[PDB]
Amino acid sequence: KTISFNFNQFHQNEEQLKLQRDARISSNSVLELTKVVNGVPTWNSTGRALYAKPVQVWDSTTGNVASFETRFSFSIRQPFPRPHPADGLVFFIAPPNTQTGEGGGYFGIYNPLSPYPFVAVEFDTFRNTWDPQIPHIGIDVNSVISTKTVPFTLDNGGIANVVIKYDASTKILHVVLVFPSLGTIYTIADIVDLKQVLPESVNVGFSAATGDPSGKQRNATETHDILSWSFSASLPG
Amino acid sequence: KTISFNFNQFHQNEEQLKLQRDARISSNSVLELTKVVNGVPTWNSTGRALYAKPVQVWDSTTGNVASFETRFSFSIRQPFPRPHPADGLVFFIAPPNTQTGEGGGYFGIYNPLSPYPFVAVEFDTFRNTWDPQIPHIGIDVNSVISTKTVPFTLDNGGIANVVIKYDASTKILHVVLVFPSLGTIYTIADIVDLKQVLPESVNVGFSAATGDPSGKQRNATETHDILSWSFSASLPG
């Protein structure tokens, strides 16, 4: 069992994607997770993009867990340096048919009064009380309080290439972040047992958020665009 | 407390390096692990380059194991496409004061006569009876029969950026290979317990080899140059 897809760009009314909240595909082929009006990103925005079909990460009959690899490119432009940009974007895996969670530092994937499990890779741009210096890459399991974190320097408005790989045999989730214009490379990895946190079928996708109104800073915002996205998974059992 | 070193280029007769066999430093600052005469690489070549001082990867007193990160750039030029270039290069960790092993597919780090333990990251270009398709990245522990491998496409004569990271807490060894001119990214990781395979003090370095005479093919060769190399280790205690 091998499932996979690839998007060299995105088209409006992409029957393969499920857009939620502020998520929208622009006319020039990019997936804009958060609201951007007249070339300017706004605060109080949250949006998600899920692959329409569910993927099987493990099978209870054989006990086998799937291995997978996903690559995507994104760009974050931070027009307003002061006071502070927010909030960042994440690639995540969650149960199917879920609704956008709380915005702000929760990226729209965490919902307090109805928490659902999830594994996520974050690119955090705002420092919340539970965060180390930003920006940083973090591996999140059921919480936005990363199990592992690594700092990185953003290429404002530049393109970022990300590779996320998960090997079921070792349970290692490793992510690579590369900014081709700067030649910088960041790597982070951790052990995660999908079988232990997620159900057999899940949805994979992205989620982002800009500054929350509670911060009372309209400049607390930035863009969260996805330029391309390929995904492949293999379930031997 | 712990070590750190960085070479942005190499100087003829580096007091800091221990060159063995065919390893030499060219007039223009590159470390040529295997023999290259008049711009042409030759077969039957083997060479290593070790950091002169030993590094402590773990302490028996505290039981603490070190974490480390190493980045380097290399270039492999394959002038003769047919019948098959050989053999590749590796970054390795071994006990101090060891001698060059057997060439060919053993890269000069394996010695059947008096085997010594070692952890290595290989960039295999020739397919031996124990190898999967080439080229590939492989993680080797005490043998050249990789515990884990991933295929990659070489940028002939191009520059390759490598990042090798080891986290003692998770025992995860993850390596990243990037070819900036092609924008390609390859990642591989595995669990390795240094404390269980290596002594408290070790040498770190590179080793490469070209076609062995037993193959009866003089074309079985290529260059194995190291352009730069930075290393860092952090042993708490």
Ligand SMILES: *[C@@H]1O[C@H](CO)[C@@H](O[C@@H]2O[C@H](CO)[C@@H](O)[C@H](O)[C@H]2NC(C)=O)[C@H](O[C@@H]2O[C@@H](C)[C@@H](O)[C@@H](O)[C@@H]2O)[C@H]1NC(C)=O
């Ligand atoms: C919110 O973002 C605005 C756009 O970056 C900031 O205004 C810009 O502030 C610059 C000085 O840091 C100034 O040179 C720019 O001309 C100005 N841009 C314009 C025309 O709006 C804004 O900064 C506040 O407003 C400006 C006008 C000054 O009064 C600053 O002292 C203020 O901090 C940002 N506001 C905040 C809360 O950071």
Ligand SMILES: *[C@@H]1O[C@H](CO)[C@@H](O[C@@H]2O[C@H](CO)[C@@H](O)[C@H](O)[C@H]2NC(C)=O)[C@H](O[C@@H]2O[C@@H](C)[C@@H](O)[C@@H](O)[C@@H]2O)[C@H]1NC(C)=O
């Ligand atoms: C492959 O490289 C080897 C390392 O230089 C060559 O070994 C020869 O070893 C001799 C003593 O062991 C030494 O005096 C020689 O300098 C050296 N090679 C020569 C002759 O320059 C090996 O050479 C072959 O094997 C040796 C034992 C001699 O019989 C040579 O005449 C052979 O050419 C190299 N093999 C080949 C096929 O090039």
Ligand SMILES: *[C@@H]1O[C@H](CO)[C@@H](O[C@@H]2O[C@H](CO)[C@@H](O)[C@H](O)[C@H]2NC(C)=O)[C@H](O[C@@H]2O[C@@H](C)[C@@H](O)[C@@H](O)[C@@H]2O)[C@H]1NC(C)=O
């Ligand atoms: C070993 O590498 C040599 C250089 O790449 C090969 O020879 C070159 O082959 C080219 C076409 O394959 C030909 O246009 C070049 O002129 C020639 N260069 C030389 C050495 O004169 C060589 O290939 C064999 O020998 C050549 C001359 C041709 O006859 C080929 O058909 C032969 O396969 C390579 N040897 C092997 C075993 O591949």
Ligand SMILES: CO[C@H]1O[C@H](CO)[C@H](O)[C@H](O)[C@H]1NC(C)=O
């Ligand atoms: C004061 O914090 C809030 O506003 C910030 C931007 O001003 C950030 O958006 C920050 O994440 C958000 N906090 C939460 C919990 O959503």
Ligand SMILES: CO[C@H]1O[C@H](CO)[C@H](O)[C@H](O)[C@H]1NC(C)=O
């Ligand atoms: C036929 O195999 C041998 O020759 C090859 C090059 O022709 C390669 O050098 C290959 O690695 C080597 N084998 C060993 C075991 O070293």
Ligand SMILES: *[C@@H]1O[C@H](CO)[C@@H](O)[C@H](O)[C@H]1NC(C)=O
């Ligand atoms: C934030 O957006 C929500 C829904 O998009 C809206 O109901 C709310 O009033 C907005 N907050 C402010 C103060 O703009």
Ligand SMILES: [Ca+2]
């Ligand atoms: Ca945050």
Ligand SMILES: [Ca+2]
């Ligand atoms: Ca080989």
Ligand SMILES: [Mn+2]
């Ligand atoms: Mn964070």
Ligand SMILES: [Mn+2]
């Ligand atoms: Mn191999």
